[PDB]
Structure formats: C-alpha cells, structure tokens
C-alpha cells in the first residue's frame, strides 16, 4: 500500500472529518513553503531614528520584538505600525548594541544582550518585565544565544567563551518577590552554571569569536559557528560537553547558523555561499550553494519545512529548496528586495558615503510568524559607519 500524499484527499476527507490526518501536516506546510515566497509584498514600517535592527523574534501573532545597534530594545505592533520601547536591563554593578534575541521553547523567557553588551538580560514573557541582572561572566559582547531548555541557555561572545546559564525557579521567584515589594523593579541575581571556551585552533587564537548558535532538539546538540571558519558540535542534555569540531568549506563571514530538524542538516552562512553540513557525515559530504550576491554576505538564514530562506547584504531574500537542490524560480531565481527604510545623513556618511544616495538595507534578521504566512524582515545599511534602520512585514 502506497502513501496517500495527495492534497485532494486531505480536502475531501476534511469535509467529512474523514480522518484528515496529521500525516498531511508536512504536505500542507511543505506546499505553503513553496507557494508563499512568490506571494509576498512589502509593507515598510517607520521606526524613527534607530541605528540598525540586528535581531528580531515574533512574540505574538501581532507583535515582533527587535534589538538594535543603538542598544534600544523595542516592539512593533505590525497590525497598527506602532513602536513601543522597552527598559534596558543593567548589571549587578554600575559599570555593540543587541546582537542577539532568543525565546525559550515554552516562550516564557526572552534573552537579549543587556545595557552592557557583555551581559545577558532576561525578560519575562509576555509582559517584558525584567527577571535578572546583567552578569559579569563574559568580558566582551554576547554575539549569540541558544535556549537548550526552558531553563538553560548557552551564550557566545567575542572572547570565544560560551556561558551556560540556568534560570532556576528561585531566580523567577526572587524577581517576583522583589518586584512586589519594591515599586522600582529589582532584579534577581544570576551566574553561569558553567563557562567553557571553544577549542583554540591553529587560526588566530584571539579570533575565537562564537558568532552563531543553533540547537538540535532531536539529539540535544548545540551547534556553534566561529568566525575563524570552524564549526563545533556539543552535547547539551545536561551540561555543555564537546562532541566534534569540523572546519567549514568557507572561512569568510561565517555569521549565521540554522538547523533543519527535518533534514538533520546545519545551514551555515558565509560571505557568498550557504553550506549544508551534517556532523554524522564525512567532512567531504557537504553541499554548497552560491548566492551569487558576491561581496554583500549572507546575514541571516532559516528553514521553513524543506525551504531555506536566506537574507543578504544586497538587502534581498533568496529561497532555496532542499529536495530540488536549487533556488525557487519566479512565476531566474525568485528574490525579494527591501525598500529604502530611513538613513541618517550623519558626519560619517557626509565624509565617506556622501556620494551614494541609496544603500541596500541588509537583512540582519528575518523570521516567519506562527501561521507560517507572514515574514518579518528587518535590518539596516551594510556599512558600520552608517546609521539608519529598515523594517517591514512581508505578506
């Protein structure tokens, strides 16, 4: 007996409740993942004078949190186009911007860079109340975060260290007991459960920066990508423990990492190519697809069923199909391109970039909502000397 995969059976069975199965779940979403990219249209938002958006996640069907190079943390109501700023959490001590935002699997805790970029800030969801202090575990900025459980998060940094943090019930109850007594919010205290550095390779021993993290829930692995071109895999069942290290086929701008749970494949961005790695495979068994957007860099990547969505410095999003092993074509690779957003004609632009009226808004972050039909895209100009933001909702 062959597998019944036809969507006509799903529709006609649904009309009868004739066991329209959960078997079709991968058919329905896989079909949508191929259809959506050509149906999307841009609705830009005006964020004012914020510097760049570096991280973003959906908090609700209606709201997206965004972190910025200005260190501002803010929320967009994408239905009303309304911007709400959030207080930035300070450290245990009275001593860049927000390069990473992450949600724990149960969506009760949000993890961001703090007022100190070296320090992890935790907020309570959905309210955005503070939970705990900015720490002093890292000596430099937090580049990436990954919630390996509802209580445990790993955080990378420019010094190459990986802090493992656990928000225990005590941390929550101390935050809540303190906020009920003191009208001014007072944090709970935190420290890393363990602090481990990535193995130092023959490459520059200071350039051990861990730029991206991704969690494989199936095997309880944490994958990690450094900017020296090396990929690392760690077991994350209970505590951060090394499994293997593999050198990536490309060692340039390895800034984003995503994991396809339906493929057991890690997608790794680079200055030009997306690489598809499987740590259980031989090191030569790696697929590499060239974006051809050469010189602009891949800046964000994610899996939607069997489709990879790739944001780039050419302010453009490509879509790639694993099963077909090629880009989606337009109804000639299909690509969206961001609008102009807003640029600040500041002194640096005046001196070095004044000869250019328009720059592409690099997609530093993108994410699909829970329905799988809306794609939030945000970023800013590629050059570090340029100040100005871009955001919009594609639907």
């Amino acid at each position: 007996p062959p597998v019944k995969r036809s969507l006509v059976y799903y529709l006609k069975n649904r009309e009868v409740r004739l066991q329209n199965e959960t078997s079709y779940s991968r058919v329905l979403h896989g079909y949508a993942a191929q259809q959506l990219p050509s149906l999307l249209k841009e609705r830009e938002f005006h964020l004012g004078t914020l510097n760049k958006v570096f991280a973003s996640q959906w908090l609700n069907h209606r709201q997206v949190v965004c972190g910025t190079k200005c260190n501002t943390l803010f929320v967009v109501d994408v239905q009303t186009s309304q911007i709400t700023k959030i207080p930035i959490l300070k450290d245990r001590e009275p001593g860049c911007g927000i390069h990473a935002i992450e949600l724990n699997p149960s969506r009760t805790l949000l993890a961001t860079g703090g007022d100190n970029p070296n320090s992890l800030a935790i907020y309570r969801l959905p309210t955005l109340d503070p939970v705990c202090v900015g720490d002093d575990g890292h000596k430099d900025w937090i580049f990436s975060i990954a919630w390996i459980s509802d209580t445990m998060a790993v955080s990378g940094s420019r010094d190459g260290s990986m802090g493992l943090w656990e928000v225990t019930d005590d941390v929550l109850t101390k935050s809540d007991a303190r906020h009920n007594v003191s009208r001014v919010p007072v944090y709970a205290h935190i420290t890393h459960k363990a602090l481990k550095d990535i193995p130092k390779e023959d490459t520059n021993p200071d350039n051990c920066k861990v730029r991206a993290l991704a969690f494989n829930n199936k095997n309880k692995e944490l994958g990690a990508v450094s900017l020296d071109g090396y990929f690392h895999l760690w077991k994350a069942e209970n505590t951060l423990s090394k499994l293997l290290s593999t050198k990536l086929p490309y060692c340039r701008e390895n800034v984003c990492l995503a994991y396809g749970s339906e493929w057991s494949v890690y997608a790794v961005g680079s200055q030009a190519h997306v690489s598809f790695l499987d740590p259980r495979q031989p090191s030569y068994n790696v697929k590499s697809v060239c974006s051809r957007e050469r010189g602009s860099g891949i800046r964000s990547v994610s899996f939607y069923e069997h489709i990879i969505t790739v944001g780039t410095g050419q302010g453009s999003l490509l879509f790639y199909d694993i099963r077909a092993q090629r880009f989606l074509e337009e109804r000639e690779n299909l690509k969206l391109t961001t609008g102009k957003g807003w640029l600040n004609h500041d002194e640096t632009w005046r001196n070095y970039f004044s000869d250019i009226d328009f720059f592409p808004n690099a997609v530093y972050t993108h994410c699909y909502d829970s329905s799988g039909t809306k794609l939030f895209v945000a970023g800013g100009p590629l050059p570090s000397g340029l100040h100005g933001n871009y955001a919009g909702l594609w639907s």
Partner: peptide
C-alpha cells in the same frame, strides 16, 4: 562594504 560584526 564595512560589514558589521
């Protein structure tokens, strides 16, 4: 082309 971090 002064990429961010």
């Amino acid at each position: 082309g002064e990429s961010e971090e």
